């Protein structure tokens, strides 16, 4: 294929993988590992299950598997299962020998140091990569825009994180985590459907409500209007057929599920939701740069894909500036400019930006942490990878 | 509000407990069952309820339980059950009295709406409080009504006939994000006892005989492979139960491993169900570990038991030891990383003299409060807004 | 959860397909390595766990020792189907006839052909059959010492009740 | 008795003039329940303050009505003042004249609304609103000094000589214990610990008060922490869970000397103090170096006085005798100084009375108070 | 809290009805005079027993506008009074000789009549509705749905 640097978005819900200059993931698959189970469920001779089965091999066959996730909240929870994802990623998805290759990895901005350390150790000491770079996921989503300033908010399966950038300087003191994302919204959909008498407690059923959420949920633009369509009308009602063949009815849960991003208290969090987390972040930036951050609020990651989320977010920031800056005086509201950037490709902006950055540093061999540098400095070799 | 005593109705899946605020017991405790017929039309007058419905199966009435898995699902039958509760048993006029009702924490907005229109339009009650049921069961746990005896923080495990739910409450506030429910309770352990009598082809496997074998013969063991082995090692572990048939003759039933294997439904729900898998000690851990960090000692220090299906011999001791194992293994993982011993946490599971009817006794104690009539919907609220007044969830966080 | 084989803690065990040919106490002829007569082996484990395990409806397999315990668990359900109303002597001859008669191995009408591997060579199939025939003859002979423990001319009802408790909804 | 109330940006301190410690000291917090699920008639209410807000905190959202020394919420600050009078001191405030405290370089509207609420809602006979740093000087038995006060929301330097303040040389920094607690909640994420609720903020403040310290030489303590666990300590969470903390113990307080750790463009407290004395005239510059008074709870760290001394002696010329004055009571010194001032004979003519407030309105506080 | 503050009503002004429908090219007193010339002809045609010519003349002009409710209601009073005085056997012969624009005006003003039964007799308006829709088809109601809001 090519001698290029490999780029790997080892995300909490999905792995995405490919090479420098790729305009889209070469492969993308669930970051899941499966073990064989029997469960008072259908069985046939038309398949065979190995003692470890992962990614697409697990997701297509998950009725037969104990499904587990090697990651949660942007951190590796189990490196023994993460080793099985990385084996699968290199040896039977890419079908590559890692020996002496250079690889670009990704993580969110406020992880434990042990996550990056043991992840780089694994690249040098299981796979024998010749060099590694680890990039902050949301600065890659800005490389995908071809853009040097704006506040970039990335919401995936594990974490929602925000990174203000101005004139290519990253405002590291302003970066933050909202510990609500696509998995919390999926756990909330299970909780809301449980009030309707449905049950989804099997490890294989989490991917079923993920696909249901991803098909049927949307962000209410106006809560009292969606509550009116919900309580006065049947128009929000929708049928979903599970891979069982069972049919379930879903109504208010379609707007009530993703509302936990804009109202985290619905999932028990005390943090402010997306609009107020983004506003408190921009409003903490210096006076001379606030306008440039409001004129480029860059959305990223799969949990930014709910229908109406850009519309609600733009409105709710105008509405929050009107409360907290103008104190309810209409006369200056038309002068406040905000622009949500909401590209079609934005679920993959971290990969697409990693494929840009990995090309920009492909020839600059000193930019990567080397295997020869790792084996003499250990974890102190990673002090190259920013502050 | 009126100066007349509030009327307390805990309508469970198995049993309805009916009475007046401030009494030392419910006035009635009888099954939540209706017996119905299956030139003027009067077949909606001809029904019976409770103990008097159980007497009517031989007279050709069809019995039904209008509450199943904690939720009302037949509003015709629940309206007739309430009118007969009010006018036969409680012998009261709704226009003179305020009512305390109950339902599970999950229960649909639709159920509280349907409940309010029957109470305010069919019966025309003066006012209605629909209580969060296991929050009342915390208040029944006090040693006396005096403020110095109150323990406003505790986990409550309620297990009745139809559903079991674990509720964290702290400083008197319900942490609704942390509610856990297991869809299995006292009826599913009866269907399991019944299924085991039926697998042995015993002379009787009627539902009353499987029920009576739970109440009298069943208990919670430490471990079912050790207890199966004890039923080889010791011979008087098998009991003989004498039962009388529907057509009025004697029978004798050998009762065996269902004595320990049937209460194991709570500690291994993979025995009961394909659809629920997490055992009750792990499910109580998930309630306290999802709950805010400053209330976790208080929630483990006071795990109140509630509802009839928590009364199995050795149940609270199995829950306490298995949860203490989960809790200390999690604390020791942290001591072994840090190189310093903790203070630990005491896990206390609390069984108490009012445990059988803790929701009703709590409802009685809370309806005695001077403020109570201000927490009710009054019929004057219902005349303005209708049944929509009761629709909003009390226990969970609402959008809007 | 359900109970798994203590012999999953063993290592470098002989194997065919992905059955473990575990150490076995027996007097029947075949390939299985003689266990210690003083210690529990997989058949003392398989019968001791069976009447708990047959109630669970979810089971995750840790390795080839559990694949062996499952095949035994399914064969105890077959034996308790075959045994009913017999004298102990008639039951020994009926359940040896059941153990000996031609059965499907994994890789052939086998009920769990997704969870078990086919035999790794044309010769691995013969060692898998000659192990499974010896195992299930011993498993039949050992079960009868429990179901005819207290009386000898009728099978104990405290064992015959599991005859319809179909483990994980699977049967041979 | 006059009352003395220190309007602490994180910690209210209240008592009677001529007493030698606060009668009451408590969090400047109002807490509100984050759950609508309730027990009827059960002693259960719309807001909690002070020690009720701390003891109930797991189910509350906690907010301080003061941020950076400025009252941002007046409806909750009047609950805090109501609680100081009617619940902590157990007095009717209309019987007692009240000394209040203020930070230098605050909004004038803060001091106007603070005199207005005291006469118009608490009905006091008389009141006064002193700058905190001159009270901390009067608490220490001296008329010359440069006072480094450091509370929850503000830190400020006031040069004062022969009882005359030098207001052109005053420095103020919007960095103190709130910002150090924020930065500790931030850097504890690197150990893998997530603290995000307004209740967990109070746990991390307790970690900070119990275990954090000022490094005497920071890059040597960093090299020490990289070499050994002898620097690491353990903390018992309210969960019974054990937390381990290492270089975060001294990286947290280093922010006070290196504000750029939180992205803030400022001099650290050494350079701020140096530039404050260096902005005073050369004859006074001889003396205040021997009288660097430290005040407020953010000056309470282990090692802070020795490192404040080793830093300020590298900026000052080598002929100077430098002293850091850091009493063990420094947490309360602005209150102890207010207790002294409200007890002085010559102070009784310079209160603001209810009569001259009725004759002038709330703008009178700018002609009566420094 | 911020969620309830209407920002859209001031940051994105929506289309008005006069952006969809063209402005009336006549003043309020100019249309009020034009109708005040027609109502006496419509009344007079009832007294001579020529109520069919009473409608044909009244229908030659129609008032519209949110500034003219008084003269619109006076025109509707005359319209319902004229329709109430035409014999039910004359309706089929009259409807088939109306233009598509006269039919559109008849079905529009029977709709304004049906909206106010305490003033207007619905029984004759429903009889006119049956016959106008039977002869001219469904499209005449479709033209009323699509019609201007200040008719
Ligand atoms: N159209 C959609 N509507 C709603 N949710 C979506 C949609 N598309 C994807 N998601 C959700 O986004 C999540 C996956 O997004 P993404 O790949 O960006 O996460 P990730 O990178 O793996 O996670 P993280 O960045 O936190 O480590 C899943 O929860 C998925 O269901
Ligand atoms: N001593 C007991 N031991 C075990 N279960 C019991 C005992 N006494 C009653 N039960 C069971 O408790 C259940 C009824 O409990 P209850 O709290 O009244 O349920 P519910 O409120 O949901 O109707 C029934 O399944 C009943 O058989
Ligand atoms: N021993 C200590 N070591 C470090 N910080 C302390 C110590 N004691 C208190 N603090 C800090 O003191 C601050 C409160 O100081 P205080 O002088 O009372 O401020 P304020 O008057 O403005 O409310 C809190 O942020 C607290 O974390
Ligand atoms: Mg991602
Ligand atoms: Mg119940
Ligand atoms: Mg202070």
UniProtKB/Swiss-Prot annotation, chain A:
What molecular function terms (GO) are annotated for this protein?
Answer: actin filament binding; ATP binding
- Residues annotated as binding ATP are 156-158, 210-214, 301-306
Q: Which domain of life is it from?
A: Eukaryota
Where in the cell? Answer: Cytoplasm, Cytoskeleton, Actin patch
Q: Does the keyword Nucleotide-binding apply?
A: yes
Which keywords does this chain's UniProt record carry? Actin-binding, ATP-binding, Cytoplasm, Cytoskeleton, Nucleotide-binding
Record GO biological process: actin cortical patch assembly; actin filament branching; Arp2/3 complex-mediated actin nucleation; endocytosis
Per the record, GO CC terms? actin cortical patch; Arp2/3 protein complex; cell cortex; cell cortex of cell tip; medial cortex
**Regions that span the bilayer:** none
- What family does this belong to? Belongs to the actin family. ARP2 subfamily.
Q: What exactly does this protein do?
A: Functions as ATP-binding component of the Arp2/3 complex which is involved in regulation of actin polymerization and together with an activating nucleation-promoting factor (NPF) mediates the formation of branched actin networks. Seems to contact the pointed end of the daughter actin filament. During cytokinesis it colocalizes to the cortical actin patches until spetation is complete. Has a role in the mobility of these patches. Essential for viability.
The entry describes its oligomerization and partners as: Component of the Arp2/3 complex composed of arp2, act2, arc1/p41-ARC, arc2/p34-ARC, arc3/p21-ARC, arc4/p20-ARC and arc5/p16-ARC.
Name under which the protein is recorded: Actin-related protein 2
What organism does this protein naturally occur in?
Schizosaccharomyces pombe (strain 972 / ATCC 24843)
UniProtKB/Swiss-Prot annotation, chain B:
> Mind telling me which Gene3D superfamilies this protein's record contains?
3.30.420.40, Actin, Chain A, domain 4
Q: Say yes or no: keyword Coiled coil present.
A: no
* Gene Ontology BP term (one): actin cortical patch organization
Q: Which Pfam families does the protein's record reference?
A: Actin (PF00022)
According to its UniProt record, which protein family does this protein belong to? Belongs to the actin family. ARP3 subfamily.
Alphabetically sorted, this entry's keywords are: Actin-binding, ATP-binding, Cytoplasm, Cytoskeleton, Nucleotide-binding
Which purpose does this protein serve, as stated in its record? Functions as ATP-binding component of the Arp2/3 complex which is involved in regulation of actin polymerization and together with an activating nucleation-promoting factor (NPF) mediates the formation of branched actin networks. Seems to contact the pointed end of the daughter actin filament. May be involved in cytokinesis.
Q: How does it assemble?
A: Component of the Arp2/3 complex composed of arp2, act2, arc1/p41-ARC, arc2/p34-ARC, arc3/p21-ARC, arc4/p20-ARC and arc5/p16-ARC.
Write the gene name: act2
One GO term in the molecular function aspect is:
ATP binding
Q: Got a GO cellular component term for this one?
A: cell division site
- The name under which this protein is listed is Actin-related protein 3
Coarsely, its chief localization is cytoplasm
Q: Where does the record say this protein resides?
A: Cytoplasm, Cytoskeleton, Actin patch
Curated annotation (Swiss-Prot), chain C:
Q: Which InterPro entries match?
A: ARPC3 (IPR007204), ARPC3_sf (IPR036753)
Q: What is the protein's quaternary organization?
A: Component of the Arp2/3 complex composed of arp2, act2, arc1/p41-ARC, arc2/p34-ARC, arc3/p21-ARC, arc4/p20-ARC and arc5/p16-ARC.
Function, as annotated, reads:
Functions as a component of the Arp2/3 complex which is involved in regulation of actin polymerization and together with an activating nucleation-promoting factor (NPF) mediates the formation of branched actin networks.
Q: Which UniProt keywords apply?
A: Actin-binding, Cytoplasm, Cytoskeleton
State the compartments where it is located.
Cytoplasm, Cytoskeleton, Actin patch
Q: What is its main location?
A: cytoplasm
Query: Source taxonomy lineage?
Result: Eukaryota, Fungi, Dikarya, Ascomycota, Taphrinomycotina
What the entry lists under Gene3D superfamilies is as follows:
Actin-related protein 2/3 complex subunit 3 (1.10.1760.10)
Per the record, a Pfam family?
Answer: P21-Arc
Record-stated family: Belongs to the ARPC3 family.
One GO process term, biological-process aspect = Arp2/3 complex-mediated actin nucleation
The entry's protein name is: Actin-related protein 2/3 complex subunit 3
Q: Single GO cellular component annotation?
A: cell tip
Please name the GO terms that the record assigns under molecular function.
Answer: actin filament binding
From Swiss-Prot, chain E:
One cellular component (GO) term of this entry:
actin cortical patch
Out of the domains of life, which is the source?
A: Eukaryota
Provide the protein's localization. Cytoplasm, Cytoskeleton, Actin patch
Keywords tagged on the record: Actin-binding, Cytoplasm, Cytoskeleton
Task: Please name the InterPro entries in this protein's record.
Answer: ARPC5 (IPR006789), ARPC5_sf (IPR036743)
GO BP terms in the entry: actin cortical patch assembly; actin filament branching; Arp2/3 complex-mediated actin nucleation; endocytosis; regulation of actin filament polymerization
Q: Name one Pfam family in it.
A: P16-Arc
Give the GO molecular function terms: actin filament binding
Protein's job: Functions as a component of the Arp2/3 complex which is involved in regulation of actin polymerization and together with an activating nucleation-promoting factor (NPF) mediates the formation of branched actin networks.
Subunit info here reads:
Component of the Arp2/3 complex composed of arp2, act2, arc1/p41-ARC, arc2/p34-ARC, arc3/p21-ARC, arc4/p20-ARC and arc5/p16-ARC.
Per the record, the similarity remark reads:
Belongs to the ARPC5 family.
What is this protein identified as? Actin-related protein 2/3 complex subunit 5
Question: The organism's lineage?
Answer: Eukaryota, Fungi, Dikarya, Ascomycota, Taphrinomycotina
């Amino acid at each position: 294929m090519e001698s290029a640097p490999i780029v790997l978005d080892n995300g909490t819900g999905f792995v995405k993988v490919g090479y420098a200059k790729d305009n889209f993931p070469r492969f993308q698959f669930p970051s899941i590992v499966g073990r064989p189970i029997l469960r008072a469920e259908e069985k046939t001779g038309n398949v065979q299950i190995k003692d470890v089965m992962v990614g697409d091999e697990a997701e297509a066959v998950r009725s037969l598997l104990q499904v587990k996730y090697p990651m949660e909240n942007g951190i590796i929870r189990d490196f023994e299962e993460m080793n099985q994802l990385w084996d699968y990623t290199f040896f039977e998805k890419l079908k590559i020998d890692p020996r002496g290759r250079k690889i670009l990895l990704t993580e969110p901005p406020m992880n434990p140091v042990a996550n990056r350390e043991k992840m780089c150790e694994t690249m040098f000491e299981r796979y024998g990569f010749g060099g590694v770079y680890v990039a902050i996921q949301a600065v890659l989503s800005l490389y995908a825009q071809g853009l040097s300033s704006g506040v970039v908010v990335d919401s995936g399966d594990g974490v929602t994180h925000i990174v203000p950038v101005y004139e290519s300087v990253v405002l590291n003191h302003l970066v933050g985590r909202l510990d609500v994302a696509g998995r919390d919204a999926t756990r909330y959909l299970i909780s809301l459907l449980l009030r309707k008498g449905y049950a989804f407690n099997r490890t294989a059923d989490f991917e079923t409500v993920r696909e249901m959420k991803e098909k049927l949920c949307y962000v209410s633009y106006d809560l009292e209007l969606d509550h009116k369509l919900s309580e006065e009308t049947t128009v929000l009602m929708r049928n979903y057929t599970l891979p069982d063949g069972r049919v379930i009815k879903v109504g208010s849960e379609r707007y009530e599920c993703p509302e936990c991003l804009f109202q985290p208290h619905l999932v028990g969090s005390e943090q402010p939701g997306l609009s107020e987390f983004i506003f408190d972040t921009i409003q903490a930036a210096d006076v001379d740069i606030r306008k440039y951050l409001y004129r480029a609020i860059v959305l990223s990651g799969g949990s930014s894909m709910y229908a109406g989320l850009p519309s609600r977010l733009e409105k709710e920031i105008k509405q929050l500036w009107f409360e907290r800056v103008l104190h309810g005086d209409p006369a200056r509201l038309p002068n406040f400019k905000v622009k949500i950037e909401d590209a079609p490709r934005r679920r993959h902006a971290v990969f697409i930006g990693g494929a840009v950055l990995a090309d920009i540093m492909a020839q600059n061999d000193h930019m990567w942490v080397s295997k020869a540098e790792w084996e003499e400095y250990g974890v102190r070799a990673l002090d190259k990878l920013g502050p | 509000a009126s100066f007349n005593v509030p009327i307390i109705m805990d309508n469970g899946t198995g049993y309805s407990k009916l009475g007046y605020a401030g009494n030392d017991a419910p006035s009635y405790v009888f099954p939540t069952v209706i017996a119905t017929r299956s030139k003027r039309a009067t077949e909606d007058l001809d029904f019976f309820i409770g103990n008097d419905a159980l007497k009517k199966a031989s007279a050709g009435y069809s019995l039904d339980y209008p509450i199943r898995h904690g939720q009302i699902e037949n509003w015709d039958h629940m309206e007739r059950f309430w009118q007969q509760s009010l006018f036969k048993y409680l012998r009261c006029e709704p226009e003179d009295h305020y009512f305390l009702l109950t339902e599970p924490p999950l229960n649909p907005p639709e159920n509280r709406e349907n409940t309010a229109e029957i109470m305010f339009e069919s019966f025309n009650c003066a006012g209605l409080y629909i209580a969060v049921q296991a929050v009342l069961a915390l208040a029944a746990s006090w040693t006396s009504s005096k403020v110095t005896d109150r323990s406003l923080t505790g986990t409550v495990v309620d297990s009745g006939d139809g559903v079991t739910h674990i509720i964290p409450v702290a400083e008197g506030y319900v942490i609704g994000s942390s509610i856990k429910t297991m869809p299995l309770a006292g009826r599913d352990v009866t269907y399991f006892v019944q299924s085991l009598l039926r697998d042995r082809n015993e002379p009787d496997s009627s539902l009353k005989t499987a029920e009576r074998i739970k109440e009298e013969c069943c208990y919670v063991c430490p471990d079912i492979v050790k207890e199966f082995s004890r039923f080889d090692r010791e011979p008087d572990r098998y009991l003989k139960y004498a039962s009388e048939s529907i057509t009025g003759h004697s029978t004798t039933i050998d009762v065996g491993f269902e004595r320990f294997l049937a209460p194991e439904i709570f500690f291994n729900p993979e025995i009961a169900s394909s659809d629920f898998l997490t055992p009750l000690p792990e499910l109580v851990d998930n309630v306290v570990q999802s709950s805010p960090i400053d209330v976790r000692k208080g929630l483990y220090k006071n795990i109140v038991l509630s509802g009839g299906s928590t009364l199995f011999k050795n149940f609270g001791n199995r829950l306490q030891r298995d949860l203490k194992r989960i809790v200390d293994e999690r604390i020791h993982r942290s001591e072994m990383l840090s190189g310093a011993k903790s203070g630990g946490v005491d896990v206390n599971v609390i069984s108490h003299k009012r445990q059988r009817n803790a929701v009703w006794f709590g409802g009685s104690l809370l309806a005695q409060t001077p403020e109570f009539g201000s927490y009710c919907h009054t019929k004057a609220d219902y005349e303005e807004y209708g049944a929509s007044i009761a629709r909003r969830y009390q226990i969970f966080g609402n959008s809007l | 959860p359900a109970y798994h084989s203590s012999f999953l803690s063993l290592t470098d065990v002989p194997t065919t397909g992905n059955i473990a040919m575990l150490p076995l106490k027996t007097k029947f002829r075949g390939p299985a390595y003689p266990a210690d007569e003083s210690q529990m082996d997989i058949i003392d484990e398989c019968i001791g766990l069976f009447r708990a395990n047959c109630f669970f409806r979810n089971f995750e397999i840790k390795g080839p020792a559990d694949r062996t315990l499952i095949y035994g668990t399914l064969f105890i359900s077959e034996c308790l189907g075959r045994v009913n109303g017999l004298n102990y002597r008639d039951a020994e001859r009926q359940l040896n006839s059941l153990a000996l008669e031609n059965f499907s191995i994994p890789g052939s009408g086998f009920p769990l052909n997704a969870l078990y591997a086919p035999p790794l060579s044309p010769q691995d199939a013969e060692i898998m059959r000659t192990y499974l025939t010896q195992f299930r003859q011993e498993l039949a002979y050992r079960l009868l010492s429990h179901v005819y423990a207290t009386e000898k001319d009728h099978p104990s009802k405290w064992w015959t009740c599991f005859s319809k408790r179909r483990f994980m909804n699977k049967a041979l | 008795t006059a009352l003395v109330c220190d309007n602490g940006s994180g910690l209210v301190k209240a008592g009677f003039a001529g007493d030698d410690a606060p009668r009451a000291v408590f969090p400047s917090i109002v807490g509100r329940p984050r759950h609508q699920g309730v027990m009827v008639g059960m002693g259960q209410k719309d807001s909690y303050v002070g020690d009720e807000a701390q003891s109930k905190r797991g189910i509350l959202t906690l907010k301080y009505p003061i941020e950076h020394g400025i009252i941002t919420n007046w409806d909750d600050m009047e609950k805090i003042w109501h609680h100081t009078f009617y619940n902590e001191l157990r007095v009717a405030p209309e019987e007692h004249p009240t000394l209040l405290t203020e930070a230098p370089l605050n909004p004038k509207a803060n001091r106007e609304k603070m005199t207005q609420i005291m006469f118009e809602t608490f009905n006091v006979p008389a009141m006064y609103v002193a700058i905190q740093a001159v009270l901390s000087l009067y608490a220490s038995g001296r008329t010359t000094g440069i006072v480094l006060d450091s509370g929850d929301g503000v830190t400020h330097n006031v040069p004062i000589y022969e009882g005359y303040a030098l207001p052109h040389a005053i420095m103020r920094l919007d960095l103190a214990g709130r910002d150090l607690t924020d930065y500790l909640m931030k850097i504890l994420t690197e150990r893998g610990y997530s603290f995000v609720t307004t209740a967990e903020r109070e746990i991390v403040r307790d970690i900070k008060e119990k275990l954090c310290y000022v490094a005497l030489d920071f890059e040597n303590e960093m090299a020490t922490a990289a070499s050994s666990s002898s620097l690491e300590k353990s903390y018992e969470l309210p969960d019974g869970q054990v937390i381990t903390i290492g270089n975060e113990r001294f990286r947290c307080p280093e922010t006070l000397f290196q504000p750029s750790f939180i992205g803030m463009e400022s001099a650290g407290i050494h350079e701020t103090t140096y530039n404050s004395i260096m902005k005073c005239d050369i004859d006074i510059r001889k003396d205040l170096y021997a009288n660097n008074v430290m005040s407020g709870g953010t000056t309470m760290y282990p090692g802070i006085a020795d490192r404040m001394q080793k830093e300020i002696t590298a900026l000052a010329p080598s002929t100077m005798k430098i002293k850091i004055i850091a009493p063990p009571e420094r947490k309360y010194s602005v209150w102890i100084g207010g207790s002294i001032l409200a007890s002085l004979s010559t102070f009784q003519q310079m209160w603001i009375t209810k009569q001259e407030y009725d004759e002038a309105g709330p703008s009178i506080v700018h002609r009566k108070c420094f | 809290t911020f969620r309830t503050l209407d920002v859209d009503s001031i940051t994105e002004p929506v289309l008005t009805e006069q952006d969809i429908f063209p402005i009336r090219n006549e003043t309020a007193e100019q249309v009020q005079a034009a109708v005040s010339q027609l109502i006496p002809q419509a009344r007079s045609a009832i007294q001579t027993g020529n109520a069919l010519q009473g409608l044909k003349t009244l229908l030659s002009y129609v008032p519209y506008g949110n500034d003219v409710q008084e003269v619109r209601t006076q025109y509707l009073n005359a319209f319902v009074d004229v329709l109430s005085n035409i014999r039910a056997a004359d309706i089929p012969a009259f409807v088939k000789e109306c233009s598509t624009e006269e039919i559109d005006n008849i079905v529009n003003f029977i709709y304004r009549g049906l909206a106010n039964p305490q003033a207007y007799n619905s029984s004759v308006l429903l009889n006119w509705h049956e016959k106008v829709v039977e002869i001219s088809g469904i499209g005449c109601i479709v033209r009323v749905l699509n019609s201007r809001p200040d008719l």
